[PDB]
Copies of this chain bind each other. A is one copy, B any other.
Amino acid sequence: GQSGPLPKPSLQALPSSLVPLEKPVTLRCQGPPGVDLYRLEKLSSSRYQDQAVLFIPAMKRSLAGRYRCSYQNGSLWSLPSDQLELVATGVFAKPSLSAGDVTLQCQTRYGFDQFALYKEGERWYRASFPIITVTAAHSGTYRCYSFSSRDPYLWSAPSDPLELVVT
């Protein structure tokens, strides 16, 4: 009577969601045992496939974007998986990264309004301002990406690494 939508499957990208152009990425939709049909779809085109796995040998700009997948067991469809945001990097010239609590500034030229900073393994910092301030000054290697909120999935090449070292 109240048999609602089956539990959402998982949708991940291997080895990662941040995919530089021409590099490989595998999108895998995973549901519990008993799936009769899988369906992976790219939200921008409303074009889906019946296979759980979408392999992209060489990442292209047109393959960047939002993806969701669902599955059917019996005559029941599941909830959609969380949206996988497939990002393409190297779409633009890399920005520059420069300097208890430290503040770094990601400087770009294209006039983008978005930035992403991350400490290699991990920690991400997304901001709509070229000046980010890491709270816990944790020694490590940093890099940032710059992009436009108009195409939030097409990212520049990573900046040269800035090695943070606290004594």
Q: Digitize A155-167: 1 where CB-to-B-CB distance is under 8 Å, 0 elsewhere.
A: 0000011111111
Alpha-carbon distance A51/B53, docked complex (angstroms): 71
- For residues 109 through 167 of chain A, which have their beta carbon under 8 Å from a beta carbon of chain B? 137, 140-141, 160-167
Stretch binding the partner chain, chosen from A32-40, A83-91, A95-103: A95-103
Q: Is the CB of A99 within 8 A of B137?
A: no
Chain B residues near A102 (CB-CB < 8 A): 163, 165, 167
The distance in angstroms between the C-alpha atoms of A166 and B98, with both chains bound, is 13
How far apart are A112's CB and chain B's nearest CB, in angstroms?
20
CB distance from A39 to the nearest CB of B (A): 41
The interface residues of chain B lying within 8 Å CB-to-CB of A162 are 160-163, 165
Contact of A98 (CB < 8 Å), options: B100, B163, B167: B163
* A160 cross-chain contacts in B, Cβ below 8 A: 160-163
Residue ID in chain B nearest A104 by CB atoms = B163
A98–B161 touching, CB < 8 Å: yes
Residues of B within 8 A of A104 (CB): 163
- What are the nearest 4 A-B pairs in CB distance? A162-B163, A165-B166, A160-B160, A99-B165
